[PDB]
């Protein structure tokens, strides 16, 4: 994040804001990113993977010089973001299953 | 026509510039001290209120007020020579306009940063039957963009490869007009700029491994086609082979950020030699490039004061 | 993949390709989050840290449909130049999990 934010500030800084504005409104939307199965404890948790049209640059003779390095930095940012995402949701699922088991133990003991 | 009548206003504009100590004092502020220092600056007359986009719009309007008049009030061969100074912004505007025309988005969706032509012509060129008709709508007498569009227009109607060949032919037409002009300094400045752009393209195409002969251009004096192939390959010794040229410190640098920083430093050093000809047009282009470097540095200082960047984070940006 | 993080620095996320929205008002950002969980914006929403600590409670209220739109607290940029307090974030995540102030 520190890498990508410093590169984005410096890239909109040395060039204009309008050049990176039109560039960012020109980039294809990078769609088809979706979530597939991690069925474990009998519970499908959705892990996330993308599709990444990345190497097909938008007419790769590009006149700004700090848009592409910033875009590679933000693709690394999206890499680390989906890794934190599919670790964080799995941690949440296992924590709520611990809460389920714990309330089931206490209920079953102290009632039946 | 008169290379000195515009040079008088150029010297009057060069008398009104910020010192290096004004940027040195901007290394320790809180964007309110920077706003107060901008209020004392010559660019502060367009300063409306407070905020980063307001400061950016004020800097853009100040650059248009201080540099945009030099494209006007010129005549003949002097006008044709001074037209090849503020050409990158109009080229980027036309490139993203052709991309939007091939995309189909709204004409008000584009930003259209300021160039050298009328904005109503760019509005009328949003809807056109042919790209040759759009070029004829955007046709100026001495602008090389119209002739370059007429030359490269005999490939297709509108392609991305057509846009890439249009940019390559725009650089080639800038080099051809520099060869076709009577100015001993601006020709070498544009040739060094084209060679640095070719080296930057060789850095930006590293890892692709495709045919560099299509990627390389013509017009440079410090680089070779075999040197371009060695730069396309992973051979930094060829970057070490640039001995005696303006790429003196540029040697063995694999970082593309440091490569572009050294390229901008070499370009600013070459443009700093533009004060040698006090009667031509190179001093005006030197003042324009100095105002552009100062404006880029002001935008960098504004971004640093906005998001709290350290002085060590901007120490690699104030070397020249 | 969508973000609601910043007024202008979300343009860098758009420059990555992945779509998004920015409003710098909490309720229009949450309303575009609402039409983004109705029209599911491809399973990931990254929300600013120091604007929404817990984005998930209102979204699971207004959509008890499943957690295909994943919601993350993504870092603000300015606070990113301070220090993440990774330790304290995991403290509040573990206390959101089991309530205990137990420290791994």
Q: Which domains does chain B have, with CATH numbers?
A: 1-75+280-320 (1.10.132.50), 76-181 (1.20.1690.10), 182-279 (1.20.1690.10)
At residue C19's C-alpha, the angle toward residues C18 and C22, to 5°, is 130
Residue C17 backbone class (left: φ over 0; alpha: ψ -120 to 50; beta: rest): left
What does the CA dihedral C35, C15, B212, B151 come to, rounded to 10 degrees?
80
* CA–centroid distance for A37 within its chain: 17
Q: Which residues contact B260 (CB under 8 A, 6 or more apart)?
A: A65, A66, B200, B203
Helices A17-24 and A67-111, axial angle in degrees (round to 10): 60
Contact B220, B247 (CB under 8 A): no
Resolution in A: 3.8
Written as six digits, the tokens of B80 are: 């044709």
Give the helix ranges, DSSP H, for chain B: 5-15, 20-25, 32-40, 52-67, 77-83, 88-103, 119-124, 131-137, 144-152, 160-179, 186-204, 212-215, 225-232, 236-240, 256-272, 282-307
DSSP state of B273: G
* CA–centroid distance for A41 within its chain: 25
DSSP state of A54: -
Contact C3, C74 (CB under 8 A): yes
Written as six digits, the tokens of B118 are: 């009328």
Domain segments of chain C as ranges: 1-104
Interface residue C101 vs chain B (CB under 8 A)? no
Q: Which residues contact B54 (CB under 8 A, 6 or more apart)?
A: B47, B48
For the four alpha carbons of A60, A63, A67 and A68, in that order, the dihedral sign comes to positive
Interface residue C77 vs chain B (CB under 8 A)? yes
- What CA–CA distance (Å, rounded) separates B28 from B231? 40
- What CA–CA distance (Å, rounded) separates B176 from B80? 13
- Among B164, B215, B303, beta carbon nearest to A59: B164
Contact B283, B275 (CB under 8 A): yes
Way it was determined: cryo-EM
Chains in contact with chain C (at least 3 beta-carbon pairs closer than 8 A): A, B
- What CA–CA distance (Å, rounded) separates B77 from B73? 13
Q: Are strands C44-48 and C2-4 parallel, antiparallel or unpaired?
A: parallel
Interface residue C78 vs chain B (CB under 8 A)? yes
Give the helix ranges, DSSP H, for chain C: 10-15, 26-38, 56-62, 77-80, 86-98
Contact C21, C4 (CB under 8 A): yes
- What CA–CA distance (Å, rounded) separates B262 from A16? 20
Contact C12, A71 (CB under 8 A): no
| B255 CB neighbour count, 10 Å cutoff | 11
- What CA–CA distance (Å, rounded) separates A77 from C48? 15
Chain C interface residues (partner A, CB cutoff 8 A): 1, 9, 11-19, 42-44, 46, 67-68, 70, 72, 74-75, 77, 80-81, 93, 97-98
Three-state SS string across B25-58, please?
HCCCCCCHHHHHHHHHCHHHHHCCCCCHHHHHHH
* Cross-strand pairs, A36: A47
Contact B262, A65 (CB under 8 A): no
Residues in chain B: 320
Closest CA to B266 of B288, B286, B248: B248
- What CA–CA distance (Å, rounded) separates B140 from C65? 60
Q: What is the DSSP string of C43-69?
A: TEEEEETTT-S--HHHHHHH--S-S-S
How many CA atoms lie within 13 Å of A23's alpha carbon, on the beta-carbon side? 28
* CA–centroid distance for B201 within its chain: 15
How many CA atoms lie within 13 Å of B153's alpha carbon, on the beta-carbon side? 15
Q: Which residues contact A43 (CB under 8 A, 6 or more apart)?
A: A93, A97
Contact A46, A36 (CB under 8 A): yes
Q: Is C78 close to B308, i.e. CB distance below 8 A? A: yes
| B154 CB neighbour count, 10 Å cutoff | 7
Closest CA to B141 of B124, B111, B116: B116
Contact C31, C74 (CB under 8 A): no
Interface residue B308 vs chain C (CB under 8 A)? yes
Residue B172 backbone class (left: φ over 0; alpha: ψ -120 to 50; beta: rest): alpha
Q: Is C81 close to B52, i.e. CB distance below 8 A? A: no
* Cross-strand pairs, B140: none
Q: Can you tell me which residue has the tokens 């739109």? A: C69
- What CA–CA distance (Å, rounded) separates B126 from B97? 7
Query: Counting runs of H as helices and runs of E as strands, what totals does chain A give?
Result: 3, 4
| C60 CB neighbour count, 10 Å cutoff | 13
The CA–CA distances, whole Å, from B35 to B48, B53, B229, B290 equal 11, 13, 48, 22
Q: Which helix (DSSP H) or strand (DSSP E) does residue A102 occupy?
A: helix A67-111
Size of interface A-C (CB pairs under 8 A): 95
Written as six digits, the tokens of B311 are: 């002085």
Q: Is residue A87 packed enough to be buried (19+ CB in 10 Å), middle (13-18) or exposed (0-12)? A: exposed
Contact C72, A81 (CB under 8 A): yes
Contact C18, C5 (CB under 8 A): no
Q: Which residues contact A99 (CB under 8 A, 6 or more apart)?
A: C97, C98
Interface residue A63 vs chain B (CB under 8 A)? yes
Q: Which residues contact B18 (CB under 8 A, 6 or more apart)?
A: B41, B42, B294
The CA–CA distances, whole Å, from A93 to A41, A100, B103, C67 equal 10, 10, 43, 11
For the four alpha carbons of B123, B124, B129 and B134, in that order, the dihedral sign comes to negative
How many CA atoms lie within 13 Å of B130's alpha carbon, on the beta-carbon side? 10
- What CA–CA distance (Å, rounded) separates A59 from A68? 12
DSSP state of A52: -
- Among C13, C43, C80, beta carbon nearest to A35: C43
3-state secondary structure of A74: helix
Written as six digits, the tokens of B133 are: 């008709």
Closest CA to B62 of B83, B41, B78, B77: B41
Contacts 24+ apart (CB under 8 A), A35-44: A35/C43, A35/C68, A35/C70, A38/A90, A41/A93, A41/A97, A43/A93, A43/A97
- What CA–CA distance (Å, rounded) separates B89 from A37? 49
């Amino acid at each position: 994040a520190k890498e990508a934010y410093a590169a984005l500030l410096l890239a909109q800084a040395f060039d204009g804001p309008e050049v990176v504005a039109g560039a960012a409104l020109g980039v294809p939307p990078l769609e088809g990113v979706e979530a597939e199965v991690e069925n474990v404890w009998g519970s499908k948790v959705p892990r996330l993977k993308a599709t990444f049209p990345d190497g097909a640059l938008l007419s790769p003779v590009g006149t700004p010089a700090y848009t592409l390095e910033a875009s590679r930095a933000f693709r690394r940012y999206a890499e680390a973001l989906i890794r934190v995402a599919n670790t964080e949701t799995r941690l949440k699922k296992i924590g709520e299953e611990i809460k389920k088991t714990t309330r089931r133990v206490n209920a079953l003991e102290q009632v039946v | 026509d008169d290379f000195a009548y515009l040079n008088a206003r150029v010297r009057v504009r060069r008398g009104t510039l910020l010192k290096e100590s004004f940027f040195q004092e901007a290394l320790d502020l809180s964007f309110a001290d920077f706003l107060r220092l901008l209020s004392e600056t010559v660019y502060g007359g367009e300063l409306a209120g407070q905020g980063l986009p307001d400061v950016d719009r004020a800097v853009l309007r100040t650059q248009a007020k201080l540099v945009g008049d030099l494209p006007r009030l010129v005549t003949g061969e002097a006008r044709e020579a001074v037209r090849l100074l503020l050409l990158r912004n109009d080229l980027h505007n036309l490139q993203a306009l052709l991309r939007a025309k091939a995309t189909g988005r709204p004409f008000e969706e584009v930003l259209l940063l300021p160039g050298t032509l009328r904005e109503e012509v760019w509005r009328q060129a949003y809807e056109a039957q042919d790209p040759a008709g759009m070029a004829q709508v955007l046709a100026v007498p001495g602008h090389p963009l119209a002739r370059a569009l007429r030359a490269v227009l005999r490939e297709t109607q509108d392609l991305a490869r057509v846009e890439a060949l249009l940019a390559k032919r725009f650089f080639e037409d800038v080099a051809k007009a520099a060869k076709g002009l009577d100015q001993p300094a601006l020709r070498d400045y544009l040739a060094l700029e084209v060679d640095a752009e070719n080296l930057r393209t060789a850095f930006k195409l590293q890892g692709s491994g495709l045919a560099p002969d299509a990627f390389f251009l013509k017009g440079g004096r410090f680089v070779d086609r075999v040197r371009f192939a060695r730069l396309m390959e992973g051979d930094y010794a060829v970057l070490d082979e640039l001995s005696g040229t303006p790429f003196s410190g540029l040697s063995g640098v694999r970082d593309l950020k440091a490569l572009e920083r050294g390229l901008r430093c070499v370009l600013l050093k070459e443009a700093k030699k533009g004060v040698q000809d006090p009667l031509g047009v190179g001093l005006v282009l030197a003042y324009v490039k100095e105002r552009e470097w100062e404006a880029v540095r002001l935008r960098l200082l504004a971004r640093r004061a906005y998001f709290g960047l350290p002085r060590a984070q901007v120490e690699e940006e104030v070397v020249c | 993949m969508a973000v609601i993080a910043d007024p202008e620095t979300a343009q860098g996320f758009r420059l990555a390709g992945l779509e998004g929205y920015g409003a710098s008002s909490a309720e229009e950002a949450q309303s575009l989050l609402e039409t983004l969980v109705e029209r599911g914006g491809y399973a990931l929403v990254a929300v600013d840290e120091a604007l929404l600590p817990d984005p998930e409670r209102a979204v699971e209220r207004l959509m008890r449909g499943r957690d295909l739109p994943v919601l993350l607290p993504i870092a603000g940029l300015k606070e990113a130049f301070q220090g993440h307090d990774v330790e304290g974030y995991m403290r509040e995540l573990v206390r959101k999990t089991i309530g205990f102030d137990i420290k791994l």
